Assembly symmetry: none
Homo-oligomer: 280 residues x 2
C-alpha cells in the first residue's frame, strides 16, 4: 500500500478533516487520502472488507462493530457539536420532528426532553436531516432537531427560525458534551496512530482558527454547496480532537446513556478495555 | 488500595482549575500516588464520601456542611477558589430585568444579598433556571442583564462583544475580603497525617494555575475537562484560584453558611456546622 485511506461519513466531521483534502498529509511516505462516504453502512462495509484504513462514523456504530468482533479500535473524537433544537415563532403545531429514528439523534433528543421535563410529541415522519429542513421550509415543521450544514441552511432560509437548545451535553457542568463521533482504525494503523492524531489536531485547529479558508476549501472540493456553511456553522460543530484515552469518560458515559434507551444500538454491551488503545 | 493511592475526587467545574496540574503531574505523598477523579455532580461527590470510596473530596461548602451535620466523618481542609458570580449587561440596556438561575439556591441568594447591600431594585427573571440556559438566552438576545459564573461567563462574554461585566458580586466596599468560601476541600480521618503535605501540594497546584494560565487551560482542554476555548487567562483571574486553610478562612466559611442557612436551611442540614467542622 502507498496511501492511507480515510473514509469520512458525509456530514460535519469532514470539516475537521478539511485541510487533509486541501493539503493531504504524508505519513511514512504514504499520502493520506480522504474520501467522503454516503452512509455508515457503506463506511462499515469498507472497514469489514479492509478497503479503508481509518473511518469516521457514529460512536454507536464503532461500539457495535467492536462488540461484533470487527478488528478496529477507537482513536478518538473530533467533533462535539452535532445536535441542536430549533423552533419557529410563533409555534403553530408543536410536534418535534426528529431524524434518525432509533439512532443517536433520536436517543439524545429523548434524553434531553426527559432531563428538562419537556414532553413534546416526537414525529419521525422525516428520517433525514435534509428532509426535516425541507419540512421546515415548506411549513410542515415548527420544531426540530438538526446538525450542520442543515441547521445553517434552515436558519438562513427561514429567518423566523431560532436555535433554542444545545442537545450535546450530559449535564450543565459538562461543557465538553458527548463523544458521539468516532475515528476508528485498523490494526496496521496502530504504528501511525500518534502521527495521524498529530495531523488531525492540526486540521481541527485550522478549521477553528481559519473558518473562512476552511469553508472555501470545502466548497472548492464540492463537499458542501457554496454558502451552506458560515463561520458560525463551524463554531457550532465544536471541532477539536480528543484521544479516546483522554475522553474515556465521555465515550463510556455516552455509550452507557445510549444503552439505557436502546442496548441493541451498541451491540448489547459496553465495549471492553480493548476498544481504546493502552497508554504504553 | 489504602496502601497504594490517595483518592481525590473533584466536582467538575471551576475548582478543577486548582487541581489542573495534578492531571499530568499528580504528586506522591508518603510513597502513595495522588489519583484525581473528576465527578460530574455534587450528589455523586457526596455519595463517594458517604460510601467511603474517596479519601479527599472537593465539593460545594453547603454539601460539606450538610454531610458534617449528618455525621459523615469529614473535616474541612480549606477552600481553593474565591470567584463568585459576576453581573453582566449589554449596552444598549433594552430591558432592566436581571436574569437569574438557581432560584432559591446559592446563585439566587448571593444575587439577592448583593442587590440588597447595594440597594439596587432590579426585577428578577427566572425563565432560564440554569446558567447554560442564560448564556443561550443572552446569545438569543432575550437577556440584557444576568448573573453568570465561570465557565459560562467566559462562553457568554466571548460570543457577544456588547456583553460586559458590571459587577463582581464580591465587590461591596473599598476593602473587600477575598469573599465567601463556597467550595470545600474535605478529608477523612486517615488523611490527617497527610493534611500539611496535601495542602502544600494544593498550594503549588493553585500557584501553577495563576502563573501558567495558558498551559493550565491547554492541559484542561487536552484532558476533556473543559471545552476548547471555554476558558481564557481572564477566566482564571476571575476564578481567584488560591488555597486558604479552613482556620484562616473561618469567617469566610461561617459568614457564607449563615447567608445560605437563613434562606435555604435544607441545603446546609438545618443548622450551621458546629466547631469541629473547622479544625484549628
Amino acid at each position: 500500500d502507498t496511501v492511507i485511506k480515510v473514509s469520512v461519513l458525509r456530514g460535519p466531521s469532514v470539516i475537521a478533516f478539511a485541510d487533509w483534502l486541501e493539503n493531504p498529509p504524508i505519513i511514512d511516505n504514504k499520502k493520506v487520502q480522504v474520501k467522503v462516504v454516503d452512509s455508515p453502512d457503506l463506511a462499515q462495509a469498507l472497514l469489514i472488507k479492509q478497503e479503508t484504513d481509518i473511518a469516521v462514523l457514529p460512536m454507536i456504530n464503532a461500539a457495535n462493530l467492536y462488540n461484533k468482533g470487527i478488528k478496529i479500535k477507537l482513536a478518538g473524537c473530533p467533533i462535539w457539536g452535532t445536535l441542536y433544537l430549533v423552533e419557529k415563532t410563533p409555534l403553530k403545531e408543536p410536534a418535534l420532528y426528529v431524524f434518525g429514528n432509533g439512532t443517536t439523534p433520536d436517543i439524545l433528543t429523548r434524553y434531553y426532553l426527559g432531563r428538562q421535563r419537556l414532553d413534546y410529541p416526537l414525529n419521525y415522519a422525516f428520517n433525514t436531516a435534509g428532509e426535516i429542513t425541507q419540512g421546515i421550509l415548506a411549513g410542515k415543521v415548527n420544531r426540530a432537531v438538526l446538525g450542520e450544514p442543515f441547521l445553517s441552511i434552515a436558519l438562513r432560509k427561514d429567518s423566523s427560525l431560532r436555535i433554542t437548545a444545545d442537545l450535546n451535553h450530559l449535564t450543565d457542568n459538562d461543557t465538553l458534551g458527548f463523544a458521539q463521533t468516532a475515528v476508528v482504525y485498523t490494526p496496521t494503523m496502530e504504528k501511525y496512530r500518534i502521527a495521524f492524531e498529530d495531523a488531525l489536531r492540526a486540521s481541527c485547529q485550522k478549521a477553528v482558527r481559519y473558518p473562512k479558508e476552511t469553508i472555501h476549501s470545502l466548497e472548492e472540493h464540492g463537499i458542501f454547496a457554496q454558502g451552506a456553511l458560515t463561520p458560525k456553522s463551524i463554531e457550532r460543530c465544536k471541532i477539536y480532537y480528543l484521544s479516546a484515552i483522554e475522553a474515556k469518560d465521555a465515550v463510556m458515559g455516552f455509550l452507557r446513556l445510549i444503552e439505557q434507551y436502546e442496548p441493541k444500538a451498541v451491540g448489547g454491551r459496553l465495549p471492553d478495555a480493548g476498544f481504546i488503545p493502552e497508554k504504553q
